[PDB]
Amino acid sequence: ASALACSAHALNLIEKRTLDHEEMKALNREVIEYFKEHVNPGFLEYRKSVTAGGDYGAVEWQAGSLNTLVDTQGQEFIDCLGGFGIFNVGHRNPVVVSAVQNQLAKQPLHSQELLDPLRAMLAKTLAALTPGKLKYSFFCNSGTESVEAALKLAKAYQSPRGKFTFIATSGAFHGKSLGALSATAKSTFRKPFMPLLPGFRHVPFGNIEAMRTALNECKKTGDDVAAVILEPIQGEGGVILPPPGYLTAVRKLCDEFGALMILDEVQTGMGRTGKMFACEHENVQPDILCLAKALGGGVMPIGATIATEEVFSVLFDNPFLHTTTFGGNPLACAAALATINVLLEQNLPAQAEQKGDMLLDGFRQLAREYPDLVQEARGKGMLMAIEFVDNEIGYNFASEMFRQRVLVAGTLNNAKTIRIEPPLTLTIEQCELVIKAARKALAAMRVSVEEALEVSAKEQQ
Amino acid sequence: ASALACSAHALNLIEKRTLDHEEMKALNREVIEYFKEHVNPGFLEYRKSVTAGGDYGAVEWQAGSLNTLVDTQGQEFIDCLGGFGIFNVGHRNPVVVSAVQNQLAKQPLHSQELLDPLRAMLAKTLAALTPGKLKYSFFCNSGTESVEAALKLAKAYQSPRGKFTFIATSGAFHGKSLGALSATAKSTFRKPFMPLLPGFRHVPFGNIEAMRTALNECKKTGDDVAAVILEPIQGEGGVILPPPGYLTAVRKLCDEFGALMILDEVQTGMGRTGKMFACEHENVQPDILCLAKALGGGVMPIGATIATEEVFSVLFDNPFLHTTTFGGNPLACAAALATINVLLEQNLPAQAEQKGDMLLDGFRQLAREYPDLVQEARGKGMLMAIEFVDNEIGYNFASEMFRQRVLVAGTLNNAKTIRIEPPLTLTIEQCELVIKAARKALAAMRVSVEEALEVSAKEQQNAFYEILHLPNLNEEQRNAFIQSLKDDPSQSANLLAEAKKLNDAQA
Amino acid sequence: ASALACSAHALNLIEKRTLDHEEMKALNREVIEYFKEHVNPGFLEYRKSVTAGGDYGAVEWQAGSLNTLVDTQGQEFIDCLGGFGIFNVGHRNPVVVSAVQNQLAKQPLHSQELLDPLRAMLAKTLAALTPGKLKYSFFCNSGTESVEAALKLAKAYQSPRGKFTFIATSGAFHGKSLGALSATAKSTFRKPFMPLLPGFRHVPFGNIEAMRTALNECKKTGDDVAAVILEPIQGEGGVILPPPGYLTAVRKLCDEFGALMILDEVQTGMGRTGKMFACEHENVQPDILCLAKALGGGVMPIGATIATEEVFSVLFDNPFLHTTTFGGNPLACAAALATINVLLEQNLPAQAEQKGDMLLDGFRQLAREYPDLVQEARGKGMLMAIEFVDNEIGYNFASEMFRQRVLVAGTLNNAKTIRIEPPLTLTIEQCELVIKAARKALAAMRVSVEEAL
Amino acid sequence: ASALACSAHALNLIEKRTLDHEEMKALNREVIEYFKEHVNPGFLEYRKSVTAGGDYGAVEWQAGSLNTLVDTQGQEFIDCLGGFGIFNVGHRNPVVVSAVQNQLAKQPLHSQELLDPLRAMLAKTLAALTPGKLKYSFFCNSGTESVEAALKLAKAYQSPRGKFTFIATSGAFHGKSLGALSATAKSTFRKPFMPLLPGFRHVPFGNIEAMRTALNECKKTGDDVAAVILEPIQGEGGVILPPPGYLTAVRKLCDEFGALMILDEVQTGMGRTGKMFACEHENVQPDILCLAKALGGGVMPIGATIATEEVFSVLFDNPFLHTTTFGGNPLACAAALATINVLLEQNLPAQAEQKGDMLLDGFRQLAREYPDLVQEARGKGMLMAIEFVDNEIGYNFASEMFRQRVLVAGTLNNAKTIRIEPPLTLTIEQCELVIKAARKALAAMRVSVEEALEVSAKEQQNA
Ligand SMILES: Cc1ncc(COP(=O)(O)O)c(C=O)c1O
Ligand SMILES: Cc1ncc(COP(=O)(O)O)c(C=O)c1O
Ligand SMILES: Cc1ncc(COP(=O)(O)O)c(C=O)c1O
Ligand SMILES: Cc1ncc(COP(=O)(O)O)c(C=O)c1O
């Protein structure tokens, strides 16, 4: 068809709230054809590996309740994926939806010349919400943009001081824009795109001595380290918790060598680990803090890079040194201001702690019961993972859970590991249903394995 | 206060549609204090340079009509800034607002595990809307992200073919993320952040022979070019139009050397130049096309990177090779689908042509009338610029226009140049009001100058010769001070003082 | 065998001045086996492509006269290869051999702690010999080392000034050490070894406007140029002469943008183009000058990097910033001091001019006569090339010349192009014999072709 | 003057074997003026810091015996500097001088088109002399060129295998050419010349776990290691001996990750540590071995890069991929062939062991006696160092030794550390004279210190 015809057919679909069997069958059939012909036929192959065929062709339609998703066939899913840590305050949180709706009625995007007042308000808010000397905020549209901004603040601070080297950690995930991907550590994500930014070096996560070595060797050779960047807990790494005091030691180590400390709280921020930021567990103040995902309330894309006056002041003489067109737009600021208001009003950080403790205990118990399938369960607050024995078992679990209308998925920088990242608003009853679904899934998986194994050993001579 | 207290005070402000004198005075005072203490005190200094004091402290409040903005004091501005090419279909275009409102009621952000249907629909739409073999779309949240995606598609296609070098053009602006900024060409934007991506080289824009040379020399030395990236017309460069046929020649040149052609239509896309894409003027099909700004309808942030099946197929075996969390979200897709529907239904590309022709004629005439102030006016469709004689005159114009409630601003990779980028929906009457405002501004500027001052010729010529004779400067330094002096004759006293200092210092 | 046994057999061979048929046959057979098993079996394949089989297995033995080489079978060759521009003052120039012999009797290599007096003397000599404000000399062991030193002087001068980009030219050859190879321009020499030094960009040779563009674009993007490096005439490029005034323009262009001018006279230096340095043709003073090959007199390996006090003074606060163990050794300095003495005493620069004019005229005439085989002949002084129509014809010429006991070979950054780089001491009679050999070679090549059909 | 005039005056000086007081005074005065005006006035400042003035202006004239140097004033020095590890077989070793003299009479430099037979002979010799599967030799003119060749062999082998990262060690010294300097580890030698080759990372020397980490992390991030390069013992680092088995472990570690092992034996090679190569102590076979300094016999500049057929075969299809004009020249080959013959015939590796053990014991004993001045003495064979308490004490020792006509000097990647690198041919009596000179030097230094202190205290009491 013409573009006009397709743009029309699609606006008509946006208005529709419901689909009869025929409208559903037609839309499902279209979305699969169009993913294949215009988006990525690879996404259809992946979703098959993590489903029992026919289930891969599930099409999102609307939010059910705070903690559920409904497909085009009316099937309601409990959300333990949380859009990879976006939906901290649930799906269509009425307070966030309200703030966005209200700003949409006045001015959704700004001129970038007149002072936009929600930018000023969210910056003031984030300054009050953040620890210590974190004071200035730069707004962008994603995690990867927030990391680019951080790397850039560090570069501008440190190049006149003669420092250009950056240290990241293996298993680390900081985004996929080429500046961010220089810090991202997974080989398969980096190799095609090399050469990446020069002067990026990786040490093991949670190993302070390896990091000391790297900083010291860089100092010896005249390749002095501008910054260390790390996640307080590695998400895509498979929920990798550092040894206690590690973050505090990295801060002293950065202080000693005159390197800037960059904390990537894109995925651990906005209450998910049981505090507003995972750096609050140790009362660690980085030089630069990166936020996205949940900051937009599961309604708007937004990122934020917050830094000390000492570091951020690099942008004061020429405020156009770093810019973006959409960053700090009124819809996004409204969504973030709502999200902070919701998390604080309802003490959802405290809820994440209680519910995470409850869920992790549940999973650790299933791990004890199914060591043939599960290596270990880890977490902190509502950031959790189950590591299975091998990759194919992890995929069978994702499918079994999906069959039972519970939504989980794999981690990026870690195969065979399933993230459990539900909304902080997940109810105690849903928490219990999740554990029962997990149990039913593991029992079904054990049968599959035992069956196969008989149907194999038969082969001999 | 607590964060809770500030988040509350701010949600209260989001609900309010009106401000009495007291609410306005209190909010203005807050926004200025908070910009200074938590955003950037630099932005307050810049806005002063481009206003008569008290005017710098104008605070955005809401959209007036399709083509106007209203501050906290109720002053309505005609928008010739267009948010730097975002507001193609105007402020709160009811069709776009409607689509976003409708999708917000179902699902604003997606899971990233279930197939999201608006992604599929917008991708199908963009495939039909785009020229030739452009077929696959990757959605992100900004121009800079769309450029990163393009660079990444090229890298993945070309590294197994042994090609790693990228060519961009001087004056070029492709974004500020470190991959994008490797292609961005302005010194002041790059130097603090070097070293940038290796293998990035710059040729003059609109010079096919310089580009041939660069590709050929790279081939000779074994540093073969993976891709050429260029804007069809340089926006931040100051609306720099290439010679006609240039784009067509770059395409044949890329075809000959086996390099991928990347077109950055972030700022020339969605009808702004008089066609849906500026590559349609010459019927040029790039390998990879970058879109953002206007694609979101002035409601949502979105970027799109569209490419051939041949190039994009690099993402098919591992679909996680390039991803983003928010990219291709349902709100953004709804906003884009609406925007395309609006541009096509109302033939706004055709309107941009007519209104741009009208506005450019107006500006070229004011240029004829005020050669003491204006060097030249250029444009294509509703992408236009006025180059003034010097930077300070450009700033005086922006201020005079703002005094008269018409919103313009400067370009990034070009000082003393004012962009005129109004909504394609600007009415013929507003077009005329814009020209009258410009005229009034230039007349007032002439008076300011003529306020017992203007001539300074020999005053300048004296500085040229004194600077040239100072015996302790090297030839790069003398050359840097004389380029400053002829480029901006109104700083001859300042530049002379500076040169005398450094001459004394090398005795 | 043991190493002791092989080191013994070889010292025995070094003492021998003559080989009977049996000693020759045994040594030839050994050298081919050992090239194959321990050096490079590739060198044996190349030498075959540029010979009529049996001729590829020629083994160097000794210098004949100033301008000839003798193989193990006693066959004497007129040398028009000149070891690629080493043998400017001939083979075993008695004045150079004498100086080396004399220093070998006192101290061949230095301590690197006591002031070594020939270093001081050769540096003083090179300062007097070089144009203008070229004053300080750093001694190394090769062309590539002399270029590394130049690149390093530029880096140390310009990094505190915020400039890091370097411009070289396509067809350019500056050596094969990884710093030098970043400036070297031929793809097949660079691709395996990438990534090379960052911030190295190439413009066409002899195109001042292309170079202006590159400097200007680098300035616009904040990647300002530290230095331009170029050969005054590209040797490995195939004897590529720049347009007149080009070098002078590059100097003004460097002056304007505040970039350092590096001239690589490794192959055009020590009189080969008709002056002591090719930069003297236009009276061009670079910031940094690179020398090797002929500077050692065809006896010693040496390189020299000479620069202004302004640039070299980067090494004054810490004189260990750039060092080499063997560089500026007394044998090498003795050899260079002798070589300069010989070139000046006998006005061999002037001879190179006259003999090059004579030889080039001869070749241009053969080009007129054999356009089926020869595209063109070029040169300046005793730096000359014949470009053939295609690569295989160039190889047939090298072979035909070798069959007639005249030694020529191909260029590096240019196929199908044969360098003629004889000693400046080549006699007028030899010059004429060379032209007659070339004629006989082309006539035989024409027959081969006409045959084939 | 004209260049002709100076080239003449200098050839006149090359012929002279003797200088009366007037010829000496005139030549010394010239050499100092010319170092200042045309070489480096910095060399004159450095040599002052390591002498009592008047002594800084000592000018080399000729070799005395195998193990001594004579200045323009006829003062004979015992050589414990060894030209930083060049003079393994002494000054003007008659066997080396003979081979060079003999080849000079036939063909000193080659055409580079005809097969040069000494290249073939030295390559065959070095193949027999080297351990295991080391088979192919490429000849150059210096240590830094030999390292460039190694880096290049690795790059050509490993880039088609998708590996581009190189690991070196801190304190490491591999040369000053920009490829080599990318592996060299001292800050002050690198910073002015950055950016250097990309893909170069440094681990601590003698720390196998730090190196494992680096290889593993590079593998995880897709920046896989092409090669490890290290000295078996760091010379410029200040004679840093790795823990025993380190080299063996690095070899297994390289084998595990598929990285090439490059051993830089430029300074530990040709018998200096008590074996022909320091890699023979642990029977470690690297993929690529680098040689220079002593390989030329203290007569000729030469470097050699030797590698497996597996690695070197990258140069077989295009033999012009890596070349040099002077490399593998007949004089240099003659000098190297002589040097190998001398080292093997006279078992100088075994002598280096015995004499080094003797000298190191002597120094360790002086360390016990002078802990106020000396931190420690280390070595292996005739590769030795004395670390002093502070830099200025190190310089006072170098001066005191020079005053007593014994030649020592500092290390590059280590201040306050004096290298003792005498010819392997140093006689037992000279060994003893060296120890006595060291003793006399330390005793004089102690008196200087003790005197200062006495002067201070009395002035104070006097108040
Ligand atoms: C720790 C971390 N950093 C950065 C990102 C990238 O965020 P975005 O996809 O919005 O660019 C992610 C997303 O998964 C993340 O988990
Ligand atoms: C041509 C072009 N590309 C890229 C960008 C950057 O887009 P964003 O600001 O959305 O990152 C701009 C912004 O002005 C632009 O004009
Ligand atoms: C211009 C130029 N530079 C550098 C070199 C390299 O000299 P070497 O082979 O001694 O390193 C050459 C050799 O042909 C040359 O012609
Ligand atoms: C171990 C080592 N490698 C390399 C070099 C550099 O060798 P050259 O000075 O011959 O360039 C040296 C010199 O001191 C060295 O000791």
Tell me how far apart the terminal alpha carbons of chain B are, to the nearest angstrom.
Answer: 58
Q: Which of D170, D198, D217 sits opposite A170 (nearest CB)?
A: D217
Euclidean distance between CA atoms A291 and A86, whole angstroms: 11
Structure tokens at D401: 């030794």
Contacts of A289 (CB under 8 A, 6+ apart): A130, A134, A263, A265, A277, A279, A305, A306, A307
Beta pairing, strands D288-291 & D260-264: parallel
Q: From CA A296, how far away is CA A122, in angstroms rounded?
A: 12
In what helix (H) or strand (E) does residue D227 lie, and over which residues does it extend? strand D225-230
Residue D356 among known ligand-binding residues:
no
CB contact under 8 A, D6 and C128: yes
Q: Which of C181, C142, C41 is nearest to D178 (CA)?
A: C181
- From first CA to last CA, the distance across chain C in angstroms is 52
**What H or E segment, with its residue span, contains residue A31?**
helix A21-34
- Put simply, the answer to whether C47 touches D125 (Cβ < 8 Å) is no
Residues spanned by CATH 3.40.640.10 within chain B? Answer: 141-345
Q: In which region does residue D320 sit, left (phi positive, over 0), alpha (psi from -120 to 50) or beta (all else)?
A: alpha
- How many other CB atoms sit within 10 Å of the CB of residue B16? 12
Sequential DSSP letters for B178-226: HHHHTT---HHHHGGG-S--SSEEEE-TT-HHHHHHHHHHHHHTT--EE
Distance, in Å, from the CA atom of C69 to the CA atom of C77, rounded to the nearest integer, reads 5
| Residue ranges, CATH 3.90.1150.10, chain C | 39-92+347-452
DSSP labels, B351-410: HHHHHHHHHHHHHHHHHHH-TTTEEEEEEETTEEEEEESSHHHHHHHHHHHHHTTEE-EE
Residue with tokens 């801060």: A251
Does the domain at C39-92+347-452 match CATH 1.10.3720.10? Answer given as: no
**Residue ranges, CATH 3.40.640.10, chain A:** 94-345
Q: Which of residues 218-247 of A touch D (CB under 8 A)?
A: 218-223
The Cα–Cα gap between D156 and D164 comes to: 10
Tell me the CA–centroid distance for residue D296 and ligand 4, in Å.
Answer: 13
> How many angstroms separate the CA atoms of C389 and C408, rounded?
17
**Secondary structure letter of residue C57 according to DSSP:** T
The strand pairing partners of C225, in sequence order, are: C165
CB pairs under 8 A between B and C: 75
Q: Which fold has domain C94-345?
A: Aspartate Aminotransferase; domain 2 (3.40.640)
The answer to whether the CB atoms of D202 and A220 lie below 8 A apart is yes
Contact D373, D388 (CB under 8 A): yes
Pick the CATH number of D347-374+402-414+422-463 from 3.30.360.10, 3.90.1150.10, 1.10.150.170, 3.20.10.10: 3.90.1150.10
Distance CA A416, CA A386 (A): 9
Question: Using CA atoms, how far apart are residues B238 and C446, in angstroms rounded to an integer?
Answer: 63
Strand ranges in C152-287 using DSSP code E only, listed in sequence order: 165-169, 200-203, 225-230, 260-264
Return phi, psi of residue A379, to 5°: 170, 175
CA dist A405 and A395 (Å) reads 15
Question: Which residues lie below 8 Å from residue D418, measured CB to CB, with a gap of 6+?
Answer: D385, D386, D388, D394, D397, D398, D408, D409, D410, D411
- Pairwise CA distance, residues A137 & A155, whole Å: 17
Q: How far is CA D362 from CA C279, D178, D355, D367, D434, in A?
A: 58, 39, 10, 9, 9
Identity of residue A151: L
Q: Contact B198/C194, CB-based, under 8 Å?
A: no
Q: From CA A111, how far away is CA D45, in angstroms rounded?
A: 65
Q: Which helix (H) or strand (E) holds B229?
A: strand B225-230
Asked if D341 and D295 count as a contact pair (C-beta separation under 8 A), the reply is no
Question: Is the bond preceding A195 in cis, omega lying within 30 degrees of 0?
Answer: yes
**Annotation-wise, does C325 bind a ligand?**
yes
Cβ–Cβ contacts within 10 Å for residue A369, how many?
Answer: 14
Per the CB < 8 A criterion, the answer to whether C254 and C261 are in contact is yes
As a whole number of angstroms, the distance between CA A402 and CA A396 comes to 10
How many degrees, rounded to 5, is the angle at CA B341 between CA B339 and CA B342? 65
Residue B263 bridge partners (DSSP): B230, B289
Enumerate helices (H) and strands (E) in chain A, giving the number of each.
16, 15
Taking the C-alpha atoms of residue D146 and residue D166, their distance in angstroms, rounded to an integer, is: 16
Residue intervals of chain A classified under CATH 3.90.1150.10 are: 57-92+348-456
Q: How far apart are CA D254 and CA D284, in angstroms?
A: 12
CB contact under 8 A, D197 and C196: yes
Indicate the fold that domain B457-504 takes in CATH: 1.20.5
Across the strands, what pairs with A383?
A380
Give CA–CA dist B312/B157, Å, rounded: 8
Cα–Cα distance for residue pair C409/C235, rounded to 1 Å: 13
CB contacts under 8 A, D 136-195 vs A, are 162, 170-171, 185-188, 190-191, 194-195
CA angle D407, D410, D416 (to 5 degrees): 125
CB atoms within 10 A of CB A249: 17
> What topology does CATH give the domain A57-92+348-456?
Aspartate Aminotransferase, domain 1 (3.90.1150)
Q: In a 3-state reduction of DSSP, which class is residue A161?
A: helix
Q: How far is CA D131 from CA B259, D128, D288, in A?
A: 48, 8, 11
A325 CA: distance to closest CA in chain D (Å): 32
Query: Hey, what amino acid is at B126?
Result: L
Torsion (CA) D418, D423, D428, D431 in degrees, nearest 10:
-10
Q: Is the CB of D189 under 6 A from ligand 4?
A: no
Contact C203, C197 (CB under 8 A): no
* Chain CA centroid to CA D115, Å: 31
Tokens representing residue A284 in the block: 């660690």
A297 is in an annotated binding site: no
| Sheet (strand C417-420) strand order | C374-380, C383-388, C417-420, C409-410
Name the residue with tokens 């501004």: B441
Cited resolution, angstroms: 2.2
Contacts 24+ apart (CB under 8 A), B453-462: B454/B372, B456/B489, B456/B490, B456/B492, B459/B492, B460/B485, B460/B489, B460/B492, B462/B492
| Antiparallel, parallel or unpaired: β C260-264 and C288-291 | parallel
Question: Contact A260/A307 with Cβ under 8 angstroms?
Answer: no
For residue A135, the surrounding DSSP H or E stretch is strand A134-140
Return d(Cα B430, Cα B90) in angstroms, integer: 13
Span from the CA of C1 to the centroid of ligand 1 (angstroms)? 65
Sign of torsion, CA C77 C83 C89 C94?
negative
Tokens of C17: 């001045």
Atom of ligand 4 nearest to the CA of D85: 16
B141-345 folds as Aspartate Aminotransferase; domain 2 (3.40.640)
Q: Quick check: D271 and D129 in contact, CB under 8 A? A: no
- Measured distance CA(A372)–CA(A366) in Å, rounded: 11
Determination approach = X-ray
Other Cβ atoms within 10 Å of A48 Cβ, number: 16
Counts of helices then strands in chain B (DSSP H, E): 19, 15
- Residue B31 to residues A134, A140, B37, B70: CA-CA distances in angstroms? 19, 19, 10, 16
* Number of neighbouring beta carbons within 10 Å of residue C65: 17
- Is the CB of B173 inside a 6 Å radius of any atom of ligand 2? yes
Beta bridge partners of C76: C70
CB-closest option in C69, C117, C338 to D111: C69
Look-up: residue for tokens 């003893």? D432
Closest to D222 (Cβ–Cβ): which among A187, A217, A223?
A187
Cα D363 to Cα D388: distance, rounded to the nearest angstrom: 12
Nearest to A146 by CA among A251, A229, A250, A226: A229
Give the span between the Cα atoms of B503 and B482, in whole angstroms: 14
Q: What is the Cα–Cα distance from B372 to B396, expressed in whole angstroms?
A: 14
Nearest chain B CA: its distance from A214 CA (Å): 20
Q: Are C304 and C336 in contact (CB under 8 A)?
A: yes
Cβ–Cβ below 8 Å for B337 and A10:
yes
Q: Ligand 4 mean position to D266 CA, how many Å?
A: 6
Angstrom CA distances, C383 to B293, C349, C411, D417, stand at 61, 12, 12, 51
| Domain ranges in chain D with CATH number 3.90.1150.10 | 347-374+402-414+422-463
